[PDB]
Amino acid sequence: KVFGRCELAAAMKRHGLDNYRGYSLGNWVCAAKFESNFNTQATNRNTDGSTDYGILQINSRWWCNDGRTPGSRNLCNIPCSALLSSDITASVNCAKKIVSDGNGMNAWVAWRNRCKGTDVQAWIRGCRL
Incomplete structure (x- = not known):
């Protein structure tokens, strides 16, 4: 699935x-x-x-198990294929675990380089929430 921004914002809020x-x-x-x-x-x-999987590009060394990655820790306790669903729940649950396991949002390189510092409220402006 390719989400719209406002549709994704509503799903993440839920x-x-x-x-x-x-x-x-x-x-x-x-x-x-x-x-x-x-x-x-x-x-x-x-x-x-x-391999980085799904809407939040979660990596298979620490977070999910794909059976092919050396040094796997599987800290979200899920198969990586669960992160490739049209339903965002497994990706949200694992993202919450990444932050809970002592990481900020700097764990996502694209956040650090493209969102940090910026007006991130633009990303939900005009949406029904």
């Missing part, structure tokens, strides 16, 4: 991400925009044997 650990909703929508261009089936296969 799952409780607005102000999760002090990160407003716009931060999450911006991270998804620049990680995956809102595409739930996005995959990026890296030369280190790991």
Whole structure:
């Protein structure tokens, strides 16, 4: 699925991400925009044997198990294929775990380089929420 920004904002709000650990909703929508261009089936296969999966490009070394990645920790306790669903729940639950396991939103390189510093409320402006 490729989400619209306002549709994704509403889904993320329903799952409780607005102000999760002090990160407003716009931060999450911006991270998804620049990680995956809102595409739930996005995959990026890296030369280190790991793969980034889904709308939030969650990596298979630490977070999900794809069976092929060296050093796997599977800290979200899920198969990586669950992150490629049209339903964002598994990706949201794992993103919450990434922040809970001692990471800010700097764990997403696209957030750090393209959202941090910026007017991230633009990403939800004009939406029905």
